[PDB]
């Protein structure tokens, strides 16, 4: 799986900042997903540059849990993501 | 269409079980070796043990000569699992023993049966030995006699995409992944077709009896996904040693979701045609992934490159 680690390193009541590990191979960009757990929200996601290893996920509710999952988009593989759930 | 993928050898083996575990879609995987331990270890489903006598099932001592012999034994066992495929991918890390001299033998019982036979192989790393790197080159020329298309990926060309602090375990997983992308990048056009689909016949007519080929890939996202990906694919380091204006055929796979724009297909198309000879057979199609949204993947296979 790529990334191989994805932990919350800093937290507020309404926003988290997750930090993944650095790839063995060049990533073009990361696909960050988070939507309602089951609740067919459009998920929305977002993307960060391949050079990054953290990401700020903002405007969260100190409540409902979401589908935290980082996709690594790399020209040189199609490996499967890494994930976590979080309700603050 | 029946597509069989066959990892011959130690390197080839772990590569296709990486394709079993990560799963390639609508394809049947086969493990071929002399070392019987690997077959019990690997989780593939169909293991083929060649050379049970002239090896005792104790591997090929990194020795290609017994590799060819252990399979020049069981051509009918190979043919048994092979019979009925339309296309076979043979995947081997070149330079060892089992997967260096036996992969050309698998290639030929398959190519004899008139399977479309595409070999996908690594050249060993510089740090591996002048003998491996010469074992590899010699196996690639005899393999070059019994395949329709040969895709060679020089593992050294991954150092340009591998960070430092890199463990050799990682360095070979990266090569595992490119062997997979080369098969998945072609198979999916047959097994996961999109609206601009390529028939098996069109793959055959662009890969049959073409000799040497190389491949590049590229992924992008957002407004400019189609132009950034195609460029990432044209300028890939796994294609930079070839001159795409001089290949008899270019095969292109646009893996996208349902939101692929008409003008984006047009864009990828027109940029590929701009770097390809006016006489090359150019086959540009799509494969569908409904999980993809606002991203895009472009794979390019230059075939018959010299
Ligand atoms: N992709 C991949 N390549 C490998 C691996 N191990 C070795 N190789 C490559 O394959 C070459 C031959 O190794 P090996 O397959 O074990 O020899 P064989 O069993 O006799 O064919 C080496 O020089 C490496 O470049 C692996 O785990 N994955």
Author numbering:
A (entry chain B): 2 to 89
B (entry chain A): 11 to 316
What does the study report here?
FtsZ is a tubulin homolog GTPase protein that is widely conserved in bacteria and plays a key role in a complex called divisome, which carries out cell division. FtsZ polymerizes into protofilaments to form the Z-ring that acts as a scaffold for accessory proteins during cell division. FtsZ treadmilling, a motion in which the protofilament polymerizes in one end (plus-end) and depolymerizes in the other end (minus-end), drives cell wall synthesis that constricts the Z-ring to form a septum of the cell. In order to aid high-resolution structure determination of the FtsZ protofilament, we developed a monobody (Mb) that binds to both KpFtsZ and EcFtsZ with high affinity.
Two crystal forms of KpFtsZtr complexed with the Mb and two crystal forms of truncated EcFtsZ (residues 11–316; EcFtsZtr) complexed with the Mb were obtained under the same crystallization conditions. The structures of the two crystal forms (P212121 and P21) of the KpFtsZtr–Mb and EcFtsZtr–Mb complexes were determined using molecular replacement with the KpFtsZtr crystal structure (Protein Data Bank (PDB) code: 6LL528) as the reference, at resolutions of 2.20 and 2.50 (KpFtsZtr–Mb) and 1.84 and 2.60 Å (EcFtsZtr–Mb), respectively. FtsZ in the P212121 and P21 crystals of the KpFtsZtr–Mb and EcFtsZtr–Mb complexes all showed the R conformation, and the crystals contained one and three complex molecules per asymmetric unit, respectively. As the P212121 and P21 crystal structures of KpFtsZtr–Mb were very similar to those of EcFtsZtr–Mb (a root-mean-square deviation (r.m.s.d.) of 0.245 Å for 366 Cα atoms for the P212121 datasets and 0.341 Å for 340 Cα atoms for the P21 datasets; Supplementary Fig. 7a, b), we hereafter describe the crystal structures of KpFtsZtr–Mb. We used EcFtsZ as a target for this selection as EcFtsZ and KpFtsZ are highly homologous with a sequence identity of 98.7%. Additionally, all the crystal structures of KpFtsZ-Mb and EcFtsZ-Mb in this study adopt the R conformation regardless of either straight or curved protofilament-like structures.
